[PDB]
Amino acid sequence: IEMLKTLPPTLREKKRYIAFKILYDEELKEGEVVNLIRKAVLEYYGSWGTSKANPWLVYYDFPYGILRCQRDNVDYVKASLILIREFKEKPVNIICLGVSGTIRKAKIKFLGIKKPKRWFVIRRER
């Protein structure tokens, strides 16, 4: 088996979760969102900043979305979100709602109302 232990929280990367929206009347696949956010995070950070602020999209079902960040550099990720201009025929709009430390709290502040827990049940049932 290939298993890696999670680092202790004094040594692990301090993270934040940015909740945002990709506003347009057009539609997107989540892989297109990952591709555009990788191109933009390169275009604003280089190798140095992308090693610095740790970008990874975690959720995109609706035009809303949730992405993970380092704690000291959420303003850098937001400035990376501003400089979207064009994707191959058209722009997309990226508009941030807020930022929190978890999904249950950022889900209820701007995104929705209830607090879901799906990772536990897909780990224990499957």
Partner: protein
């Protein structure tokens, strides 16, 4: 300032000496090593003005039968490297406490470089982490991002536990090699310049220790001099 690369021609190494480099390591990534290659290393090292230390390398074999055979092939050469993304061989490689430097946690794994238990066991057994750079020059953008994220994670896990780190380019051709000031400025760009100097200091001291160990009659750091009772 010590590099780790393979030898192809003489003009490349003559360009290496003319810049800053005082010495380097010849890299044998194969299972067929003989004295003819090492004599050619001697000839090219005595060609202009240099000293070269040769090593051997293994990849993707068994768990600890490989450990015994690696010790048996290591008893002929100076230093050694074991590369592999498998954690199972990595535990034995940091457990056997006789390998000098360790490489490849990032491209065979693609999940995370060093585990916390792995870093604590490396602190007890005193094995060093070697950071390659040819992996940076044969990838794409987000691959560079994930790879340097893994290197910054490993840099923290080596800084907090005082794990020795040796930088190298892991070169393969005439032009894959880069400058030592370049690598120092890049490790300055990542976290700190003092740790960047400490990496080069450790890279010199580990080859100095292996040379001082295999030079004379030295067993568990015991120096024996004139008028020996040696059998």
């Amino acid at each position: 300032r010590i590099d780790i690369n393979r030898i192809e021609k003489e003009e490349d190494i003559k360009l290496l000496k003319e810049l800053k480099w005082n010495g380097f390591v010849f890299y044998q990534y194969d299972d067929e090593f003989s004295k003819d290659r090492y004599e050619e290393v001697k000839a090219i090292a005595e060609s202009y003005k240099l000293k070269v230390y040769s090593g051997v390398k293994i990849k993707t074999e068994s768990s600890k039968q490989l450990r015994d055979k690696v010790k048996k092939f290591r008893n002929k050469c100076h230093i050694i490297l074991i590369e592999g993304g498998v954690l199972k061989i990595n535990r034995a490689a940091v457990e056997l406490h006789d390998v000098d430097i360790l490489s490849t946690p990032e491209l065979g794994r693609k999940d995370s470089g060093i585990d916390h238990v792995l870093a604590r066991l490396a602190s007890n057994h005193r094995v060093a982490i070697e950071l390659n750079f040819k992996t940076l020059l044969n990838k794409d953008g987000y691959e560079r991002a994930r790879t340097l994220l893994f290197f910054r994670n490993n840099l923290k896990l080596a800084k907090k536990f005082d794990v020795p780190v040796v930088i190298s380019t892991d070169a393969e051709n005439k032009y894959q090699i880069k400058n030592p000031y370049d690598l120092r400025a890049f490790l300055n760009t990542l976290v700190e310049p003092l740790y960047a100097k400490k990496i080069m200091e450790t890279a010199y001291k580990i080859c100095d220790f292996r040379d001082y160990l295999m030079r004379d009659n030295v067993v568990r750091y015991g120096v024996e001099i004139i008028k020996e009772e040696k059998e």
